[PDB]
């Protein structure tokens, strides 16, 4: 999840904009930018990843008791993500034969 | 802070909107509304008090090493503290282009 | 620990199965295979050891370079979870009018 710095070089943050040179899936490199102002927020003096508008991602909003907002809210949306794992870590050649160690 | 419910009566929530009838300081009553969609948000299935735009409320934004966004941000109580966040969490390289996932 | 690659030739991933041709200690070569499904887990979109069953939630499995397993993996399933927040925390009655503070 994420993991851009592993495949990108020459990164800089100018104001609220991140710029980097990232590898392509089949070779070459591409310089590109992304404004982080729409995904990061200031919560109590601590930078954080911001959530969703709750009226689009929750159901049955209601008052509970005297002062409580209650809802059934949705978790992070499900998506497909590229990932990799080094098979050298635990797969071995043991007399011509592959096994786990 | 806050605690409207100690001086207000007949509260209701419809959508993102809170409506209540509150006591005026020097006697009498007033029904008013507030939109909770501008101050509350959904964080991975939990409702939380929204933070602030970090550009207009933080100072000295810089990349720290590989993938860290570093700055000093105004706390609730308006005093600056040093804060960092790892951009690798959610910024990915999608075929040469930088994208939030 | 492991490192089959630097001793094994012509490796391929079909589904969850690694098939390669490896050199014996005393002799020539042998082609064997190992099912990785029962040994690699998909944890929220990241391939990991110390678990099983990744193949049910990951697609387009390929060999990247000489020893890397590459895939497109499903992140945690989205679900509706009950949540509450206390409005008293930051909503006040300012002279009969609801305000955020």
From Swiss-Prot, chains A, B, C:
Listed GO biological process terms: regulation of defense response to virus
SMART domains in the record: CVNH
Molecular function terms from GO: carbohydrate binding
Disulfide bonds listed in the record: 8-22, 58-73
InterPro entries: Cyanovirin-N, Cyanovirin-N_sf
Alphabetized UniProt keyword annotations: Antiviral protein, Disulfide bond, Lectin
Biotechnology: Overexpression of this protein to provide quantities adequate for medical use as a topical microbiocide has been attempted in a number of systems including E.coli, Lactobacillus jensenii, the yeast Pichia pastoris and Nicotiana tabacum; see PubMed:20162270 for a review.
Keyword Ubl conjugation appears in the UniProt entry: no
Post-translational modifications: Cleavage, or reduction and alkylation of the disulfide bonds results in the loss of anti-HIV activity.
Pfam families: CVNH
Subunit structure: In solution exists as a metastable domain-swapped homodimer which very slowly converts into a more stable monomeric form at room temperature. Under physiological conditions it is unlikely that the dimeric species exists and indeed the monomer is more active against HIV. Interacts with HIV-1 gp120.
Similarity comment: family membership: Belongs to the cyanovirin-N family.
Other remarks in the entry: Its activity in situ is unknown, however it acts as a viral entry inhibitor, inhibiting HIV-1, HIV-2 and simian immunodeficiency virus (and some other viruses such as feline immunodeficiency virus, measles virus and human herpesvirus) infection and replication. It prevents essential interactions between the envelope glycoprotein and target cell receptors by binding to carbohydrates on viral protein gp120 and possibly by other mechanisms as well. Addition to cells must occur before or shortly after virus addition. Is remarkably stabile; the protein can withstand multiple freeze-thaw cycles, dissolution in organic solvents, treatment with salt, detergent, H(2)O(2) and boiling without significant loss of anti-HIV activity.
Cited function: Mannose-binding lectin.
Name this polypeptide is given: Cyanovirin-N
Species for this entry: Nostoc ellipsosporum
